[PDB]
Amino acid sequence: MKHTELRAAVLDALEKHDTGATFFDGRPAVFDEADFPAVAVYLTGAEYTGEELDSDTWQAELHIEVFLPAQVPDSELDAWMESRIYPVMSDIPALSDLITSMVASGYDYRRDDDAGLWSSADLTYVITYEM
Amino acid sequence: MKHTELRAAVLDALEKHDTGATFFDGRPAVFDEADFPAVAVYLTGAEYTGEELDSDTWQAELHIEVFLPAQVPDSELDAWMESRIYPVMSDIPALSDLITSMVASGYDYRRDDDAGLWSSADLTYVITYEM
Amino acid sequence: MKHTELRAAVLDALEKHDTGATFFDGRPAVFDEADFPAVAVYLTGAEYTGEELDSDTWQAELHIEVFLPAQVPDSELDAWMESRIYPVMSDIPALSDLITSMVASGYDYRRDDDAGLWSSADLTYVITYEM
Amino acid sequence: MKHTELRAAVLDALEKHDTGATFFDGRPAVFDEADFPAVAVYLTGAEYTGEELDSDTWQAELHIEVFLPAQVPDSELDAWMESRIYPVMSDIPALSDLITSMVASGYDYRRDDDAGLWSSADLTYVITYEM
Amino acid sequence: MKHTELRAAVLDALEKHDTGATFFDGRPAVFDEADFPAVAVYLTGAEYTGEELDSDTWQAELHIEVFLPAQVPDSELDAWMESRIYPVMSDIPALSDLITSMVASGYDYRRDDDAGLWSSADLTYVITYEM
Amino acid sequence: MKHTELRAAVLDALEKHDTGATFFDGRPAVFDEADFPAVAVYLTGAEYTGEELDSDTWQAELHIEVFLPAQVPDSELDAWMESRIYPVMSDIPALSDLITSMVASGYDYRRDDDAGLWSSADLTYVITYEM
Amino acid sequence: DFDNLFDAAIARADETIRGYMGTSATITSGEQSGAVIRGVFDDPENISYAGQGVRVEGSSPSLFVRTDEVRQLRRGDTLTIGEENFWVDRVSPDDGGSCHLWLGRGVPPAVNRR
Amino acid sequence: DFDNLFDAAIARADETIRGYMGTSATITSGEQSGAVIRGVFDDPENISYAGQGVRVEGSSPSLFVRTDEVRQLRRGDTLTIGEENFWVDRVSPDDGGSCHLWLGRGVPPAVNRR
Amino acid sequence: DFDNLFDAAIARADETIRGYMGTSATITSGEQSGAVIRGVFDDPENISYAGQGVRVEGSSPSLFVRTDEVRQLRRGDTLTIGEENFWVDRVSPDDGGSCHLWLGRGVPPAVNRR
Amino acid sequence: DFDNLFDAAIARADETIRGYMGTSATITSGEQSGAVIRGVFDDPENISYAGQGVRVEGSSPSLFVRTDEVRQLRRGDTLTIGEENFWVDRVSPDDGGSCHLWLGRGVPPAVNRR
Amino acid sequence: DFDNLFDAAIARADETIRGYMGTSATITSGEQSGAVIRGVFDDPENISYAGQGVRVEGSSPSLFVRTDEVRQLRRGDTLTIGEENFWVDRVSPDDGGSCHLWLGRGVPPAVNRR
Amino acid sequence: DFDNLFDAAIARADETIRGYMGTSATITSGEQSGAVIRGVFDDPENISYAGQGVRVEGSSPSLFVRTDEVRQLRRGDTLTIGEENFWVDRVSPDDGGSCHLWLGRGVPPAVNRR
DSSP string, F42-104: EEE--B-----SSS--EEEEEEEEEEEETT--HHHHHHIIIIISHHHHT--HHHHHH-SEEEE
E88: DSSP letter? G
| Those residues with Cβ within 8 angstroms of residue B71's Cβ, 6 or more apart along the chain or in another chain | A28, A30, B111, B116, B119, K53, L109
Instruction: In whole angstroms, give the CA distance from residue F7 to residue A75.
Output: 9
Chains J, F in contact, 3 or more Cβ pairs below 8 Å: no
Residues facing K81 on adjacent strands: K84
At C23, give phi and psi (nearest 5°).
Answer: -120, 50
Residues from chain F contacting residue I59 (CB–CB below 8 Å): 33
Is F29–I51 a contact, with Cβ atoms under 8 angstroms apart? Answer: yes
Instruction: In whole angstroms, give the CA distance from residue E92 to residue B11.
Output: 76
Is G114–D15 a contact, with Cβ atoms under 8 angstroms apart? Answer: yes
Chains I, J in contact, 3 or more Cβ pairs below 8 Å: no
| Those residues with Cβ within 8 angstroms of residue F81's Cβ, 6 or more apart along the chain or in another chain | F66, F107, F121, F123
**β strands within chain I, DSSP E:** 23-28, 35-39, 45-46, 58-59, 65-66, 78-81, 84-91, 98-99, 101-103
* Strands of the G84-91 sheet, one edge to the other: G35-39, G23-28, G78-81, G84-91, G101-103
Total Cβ atoms within 10 A of residue J89: 20
b/e map B37-62, b = 16+ CB within 10 Å = bbbbbbbeebebeeeeeeeebbbbeb
Residue H69 contacts residue H77 (beta carbons within 8 Å): no
Cα–chain center distance at H114? 26
Residues from chain H contacting residue E113 (CB–CB below 8 Å): 49, 52-53
| Those residues with Cβ within 8 angstroms of residue E125's Cβ, 6 or more apart along the chain or in another chain | E61, E62, E63, E64, E89, E102, E103, E104, E105
The helix or strand, by DSSP H or E, that contains position E120, with its residue range, turns out to be: strand E119-129
Taken in order G36, G38, G44, G50, the sign of the CA dihedral is negative
Residue H4 contacts residue H13 (beta carbons within 8 Å): no
Instruction: In whole angstroms, give the CA distance from residue J92 to residue L58.
Output: 9
Helices A2-16 & B74-84 angle (0-180, nearest 10): 150
Residues from chain H contacting residue E116 (CB–CB below 8 Å): 53
Residue from the list J75, J109, J112 with its beta carbon closest to the beta carbon of B25: J112
Residues facing L38 on adjacent strands: L24
The helix or strand, by DSSP H or E, that contains position J19, with its residue range, turns out to be: helix J7-21
Instruction: In whole angstroms, give the CA distance from residue H64 to residue H59.
Output: 16
Q: Which of I71, I67, I86 is nearest to I28 (CA)?
A: I86
Residues facing F127 on adjacent strands: F60, F102
Contacts 24+ apart (CB under 8 A), E59-63: E59/E126, E59/E127, E59/E128, E59/E129, E60/E127, E60/E129, E60/F107, E61/E105, E61/E124, E61/E125, E61/E126, E61/E127, E62/E6, E62/E10, E62/E102, E62/E124, E62/E125, E62/E126, E62/E127, E63/E122, E63/E123, E63/E124, E63/E125
The helix or strand, by DSSP H or E, that contains position C123, with its residue range, turns out to be: strand C118-128
Q: Which of I107, I66, I59, I61 is nearest to I81 (CA)?
A: I61
D116, closest residue in chain J (CA to CA): J53
Torsion, CA F3, CA F9, CA F12, CA F14, rounded to 10: -90
Q: Which of G111, B109, D63 is nearest to E71 (CA)?
A: G111
Instruction: In whole angstroms, give the CA distance from residue G99 to residue G66.
Output: 6
Q: Which of C77, C57, C59 is nearest to C67 (CA)?
A: C77
Instruction: In whole angstroms, give the CA distance from residue E107 to residue J70.
Output: 68
User: Is residue I54 left, alpha or beta, with left meaning phi > 0 and alpha meaning psi from -120 to 50?
Assistant: alpha
List for chain C the helix, strand, coil content (%; round to 5): 25, 35, 35
Sort K113 into a burial class: Cβ within 10 Å, 0-12 / 13-18 / 19+.
middle
Is E108–D42 a contact, with Cβ atoms under 8 angstroms apart? Answer: no
Sort C36 into a burial class: Cβ within 10 Å, 0-12 / 13-18 / 19+.
middle
Is B24–J112 a contact, with Cβ atoms under 8 angstroms apart? Answer: yes
| Chains linked to J by 3 or more Cβ pairs within 8 Å | B, C, D, H, L
| Those residues with Cβ within 8 angstroms of residue I84's Cβ, 6 or more apart along the chain or in another chain | none
Chains J, A in contact, 3 or more Cβ pairs below 8 Å: no
Distances (CA, A) of H64 to D117, G3, H20, H108, J93: 21, 16, 13, 20, 35
- Specify the experimental method: cryo-EM
Q: Which of I53, I27, I24, I50 is nearest to I39 (CA)?
A: I24
Q: Which of I76, I79, I47 is nearest to I60 (CA)?
A: I47
The C-alpha angle with vertex F80 and arms to F78 and F85, in degrees rounded to 5, equals 120
Tally the residues of chain J. 114
Residues from chain F contacting residue E60 (CB–CB below 8 Å): 107
Instruction: In whole angstroms, give the CA distance from residue F120 to residue F39.
Output: 10
Helices F3-15 & A74-84 angle (0-180, nearest 10): 140
- Separation in Å, CA of K95 to nearest CA in chain I: 7
Distances (CA, A) of I110 to C17, E25, E35, F112, G33: 78, 12, 18, 18, 47
At A3, give phi and psi (nearest 5°).
Answer: -65, -40
| Chains linked to D by 3 or more Cβ pairs within 8 Å | C, E, G, H, J
Instruction: In whole angstroms, give the CA distance from residue E1 to residue F78.
Output: 7
Resolution in units of Å:
3.9
Taken in order J32, J36, J40, J46, the sign of the CA dihedral is positive
Radius of gyration of chain G measured on its C-alpha atoms: 16
I76, closest residue in chain E (CA to CA): E30
| Those residues with Cβ within 8 angstroms of residue A101's Cβ, 6 or more apart along the chain or in another chain | A127, A128
Is E65–G51 a contact, with Cβ atoms under 8 angstroms apart? Answer: yes
Residues from chain I contacting residue F27 (CB–CB below 8 Å): 51-53
Residues facing I81 on adjacent strands: I84
- Separation in Å, CA of D28 to nearest CA in chain H: 5
Is K93–I45 a contact, with Cβ atoms under 8 angstroms apart? Answer: yes
Domain ranges of chain B: 2-130
Give me the half-sphere count of Cα atoms (radius 13 Å) on the Cβ side of residue F115.
Answer: 15
Residue from the list B109, B110, B113 with its beta carbon closest to the beta carbon of K49: B113
The helix or strand, by DSSP H or E, that contains position C41, with its residue range, turns out to be: strand C38-47
Is F74–E26 a contact, with Cβ atoms under 8 angstroms apart? Answer: yes
* Domain I22-114: assigned CATH number: 2.40.10.180
b/e map E18-55, b = 16+ CB within 10 Å = eeebbebbbbbbbbeeeeebbbbbbbeebebeeeeeee
Radius of gyration of chain L measured on its C-alpha atoms: 16
Our separate counts of H helices and E strands in chain C read: 3, 5
| Those residues with Cβ within 8 angstroms of residue B62's Cβ, 6 or more apart along the chain or in another chain | B10, B41, B43, B124, B125, B126, B127
Report how far apart the first and last C-alpha atoms of chain A are (Å, whole number).
7
Distances (CA, A) of D60 to B109, D131, E105, F104: 47, 10, 12, 35
Instruction: In whole angstroms, give the CA distance from residue I45 to residue C21.
Output: 62
Residues facing D28 on adjacent strands: none
- Separation in Å, CA of I24 to nearest CA in chain G: 25
| Those residues with Cβ within 8 angstroms of residue E85's Cβ, 6 or more apart along the chain or in another chain | E14, E39, E64, E66, E123
Sort B122 into a burial class: Cβ within 10 Å, 0-12 / 13-18 / 19+.
middle
Which of C109, C118, C125 to probe by mutation at the B interface, max B CB count within 10 Å? C109
Residue D77 contacts residue C1 (beta carbons within 8 Å): no
SS3 category, F15: helix
Radius of gyration of chain E measured on its C-alpha atoms: 16
C70, closest residue in chain L (CA to CA): L53
Instruction: In whole angstroms, give the CA distance from residue C84 to residue C76.
Output: 11
J55, closest residue in chain D (CA to CA): D113
Instruction: In whole angstroms, give the CA distance from residue G66 to residue G94.
Output: 8
I112, closest residue in chain F (CA to CA): F73
Report how far apart the first and last C-alpha atoms of chain H are (Å, whole number).
42
The C-alpha angle with vertex E57 and arms to E56 and E63, in degrees rounded to 5, equals 135
K52 touching B, CB under 8 A? yes
Q: Which of A97, A35, E28, A121 is nearest to I52 (CA)?
A: A121
Is I93–G45 a contact, with Cβ atoms under 8 angstroms apart? Answer: yes
Residue I73 contacts residue I102 (beta carbons within 8 Å): no
Query: How many C×L Cβ pairs under 8 Å?
Result: 9
The C-alpha angle with vertex C107 and arms to C106 and C111, in degrees rounded to 5, equals 140
Residues from chain L contacting residue C111 (CB–CB below 8 Å): 52-53
Is I5–G20 a contact, with Cβ atoms under 8 angstroms apart? Answer: yes
Dmax (CA) for chain L in angstroms is 57
Give me the half-sphere count of Cα atoms (radius 13 Å) on the Cβ side of residue C30.
Answer: 18
A96: DSSP letter? H
Distances (CA, A) of B22 to B37, I29, J85: 7, 79, 29
Q: Which amino acid is at D46?
A: A
E25, closest residue in chain I (CA to CA): I114
Sort E122 into a burial class: Cβ within 10 Å, 0-12 / 13-18 / 19+.
middle
Residues from chain D contacting residue G112 (CB–CB below 8 Å): 24-26, 28
Report how far apart the first and last C-alpha atoms of chain K are (Å, whole number).
41
Is E73–G110 a contact, with Cβ atoms under 8 angstroms apart? Answer: yes
Residue E23 contacts residue E14 (beta carbons within 8 Å): yes
User: Is residue K37 left, alpha or beta, with left meaning phi > 0 and alpha meaning psi from -120 to 50?
Assistant: beta
Alpha helices by DSSP H, listed for chain E, are: 3-16, 74-80, 93-98
The helix or strand, by DSSP H or E, that contains position K32, with its residue range, turns out to be: none
Pairing of strands I23-28, I35-39: antiparallel
Q: Which of F25, F15, F11, F35 is nearest to F118 (CA)?
A: F35
| Those residues with Cβ within 8 angstroms of residue A79's Cβ, 6 or more apart along the chain or in another chain | F1, F4
Pairing of strands C38-47, C23-25: parallel
The C-alpha angle with vertex A47 and arms to A41 and A48, in degrees rounded to 5, equals 140
Residues from chain B contacting residue A7 (CB–CB below 8 Å): 75
Tally the residues of chain E. 131
Residue D125 contacts residue D102 (beta carbons within 8 Å): yes
Taken in order B35, B39, B41, B44, the sign of the CA dihedral is positive
C72 touching B, CB under 8 A? yes
Residue from the list B4, B30, B131 with its beta carbon closest to the beta carbon of C75: B4
b/e map D8-35, b = 16+ CB within 10 Å = bbbbebbeeeeeebbbbbbbbbbbbbee
Is B82–A1 a contact, with Cβ atoms under 8 angstroms apart? Answer: yes
b/e map F19-43, b = 16+ CB within 10 Å = eebbbbbbbbbbbebeebbbbbbbb
The helix or strand, by DSSP H or E, that contains position J46, with its residue range, turns out to be: strand J45-46
- Separation in Å, CA of K89 to nearest CA in chain F: 10
Residue A107 contacts residue A81 (beta carbons within 8 Å): yes
Instruction: In whole angstroms, give the CA distance from residue J38 to residue G93.
Output: 46
| Chains linked to K by 3 or more Cβ pairs within 8 Å | A, B, F, I, L
Q: Which of B106, B131, B107, B104 is nearest to B121 (CA)?
A: B107
Radius of gyration of chain K measured on its C-alpha atoms: 16
Tally the residues of chain K. 114
| Chains linked to C by 3 or more Cβ pairs within 8 Å | B, D, H, J, L
Is A78–F3 a contact, with Cβ atoms under 8 angstroms apart? Answer: yes
Class of domain F2-130: alpha beta
List for chain J the helix, strand, coil content (%; round to 5): 15, 35, 55
Report how far apart the first and last C-alpha atoms of chain I are (Å, whole number).
41
Q: Which of E84, E107, E86 is nearest to E16 (CA)?
A: E84
At C7, give phi and psi (nearest 5°).
Answer: -65, -40
Total Cβ atoms within 10 A of residue K67: 16
Residue I40 contacts residue I22 (beta carbons within 8 Å): yes
G55 touching I, CB under 8 A? yes
At J10, give phi and psi (nearest 5°).
Answer: -70, -30
User: Is residue L20 left, alpha or beta, with left meaning phi > 0 and alpha meaning psi from -120 to 50?
Assistant: alpha
Give me the half-sphere count of Cα atoms (radius 13 Å) on the Cβ side of residue G10.
Answer: 16
Torsion, CA D47, CA D52, CA D56, CA D62, rounded to 10: -40
Residue C111 contacts residue C118 (beta carbons within 8 Å): yes
Which of B74, B112, B119, B126 to probe by mutation at the A interface, max A CB count within 10 Å? B74
